[model samples]
Target: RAGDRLSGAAARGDVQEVRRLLHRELVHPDALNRFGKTALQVMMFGSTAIALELLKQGASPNVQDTSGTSPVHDAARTGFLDTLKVLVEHGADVNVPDGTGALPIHLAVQEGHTAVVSFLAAESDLHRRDARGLTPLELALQRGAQDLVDILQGHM
Candidate 1:
């Protein structure tokens, strides 16, 4: 129940509440919610502050949920460049994949987030194919994200 409390606060970006739990009550940053997903894995994509505090208090950035959903994957999918940047700053892997075998870059390109795609293209696996056998570049092509196609292709 306590873990769920912390997790709920985290998912809502309650950085102050998170700090209280972590410092005052000693709730572990990696504490799992009712669904067994850690706060980081379920955190709001727009919550860079939460990511910063959680990572500072020793949350595992690379930790994945049952569906292989890491914070980086969600952040990338939502085009939260700041949150993705903070996740990576705290050691989240750039190429971490979800259950569908889609990397952060794949989601970025698929969703037509040109800036996110451009940011990821530098450090991501340009040639790595997902479960569906499509590379990030190919996904970009299929999505008709011409802007991202230019970025992804240039990285290869």
Candidate 2:
């Protein structure tokens, strides 16, 4: 659990300490904390700049937390375009599932993050149905995220 010190520090927006801890190995880049949360998820919900720094430090974009939520989901649900872009650029999984099997692209659509929907469109897996057989496009339409619905429909 101490391996997740970076997760806590990053969650707290202590960017400098996060960097220092990363260099000191006190926080493994891929460590999951008590909540099964990662440094990237913390930074994703905490600060875009800090998340970007961690991305540059080689954080694993595909690592899911205990909740099965990826950093991309964090970026998408929060509508953090910069962080989303960083995650995408770093190869984050657009199709990484949530605890319920919903992916980042699902969150993007449900939350009406049009840019995220656009970015995730490049991922073929984003079109896959989840455990509930609900595709991201379906979630978007159900949620009335018209812009996201339109974008996803463009792909279909």
Candidate 3:
């Protein structure tokens, strides 16, 4: 009950609600919703403060969804540098591959989030290929993202 409520709060990035739930121990920081997803897994990628609070409350940054995508994955996909940083600061690994075998950098490169790609370039395996057998550089080429290409190229 409280776990699902925390999940909803996290999903929408309701920082105050999350803090309250966590403060009172109404739910575990790693509590799961009805969908079997933890608050951190589906947290709003734009909210770094929320992420920080979750981590402070003992939420694991490495928690993955059904697809093996962590908060770092969504933060990269959504182009949130701060969120990515917060997650990484709390031990989120960009190298972790999702269900499609694509790491966070792959999504960042393919999504044309140049800033995100730039940030992740220093952390992810630039030469690592996804399930489609395409590296971040190749994914950049596929997207015709000259900006991302430029960023990805430097890591090679």
lDDT winner? 1
lDDT of each: 0.85, 0.74, 0.84
lDDT of 2: 0.74
The candidates, ranked best first by TM-score, are 1, 3, 2
Estimate the TM-score for candidate 1.
0.93
TM-score-wise, the better of 1 and 2 is 1
lDDT of 1: 0.85
Q: Which regions of candidate 1 fall more than 4 Å away from where they truly are?
A: none
List CA RMSD, all candidates. 1.3, 2.8, 1.3
Per-residue lDDT tens digits for candidate 1, residues 41-96, read 87776878888888999999988778887788888889999988888887889876
lDDT of 3 by residue, 1-156 (tens): 877999889889899998899887657788878888788887887888888888988998888878777888888888999988888888888898999989998988777887888888888877778899999898877878888888777778
Query: Which run of 10 residues does model 3 get worst, by summed lDDT?
Result: 24-33
| Model 3 per-residue lDDT at 127 | 73
Better model by lDDT, 1 or 2?
A: 1
Which scores better on TM-score, 2 or 3? Answer: 3
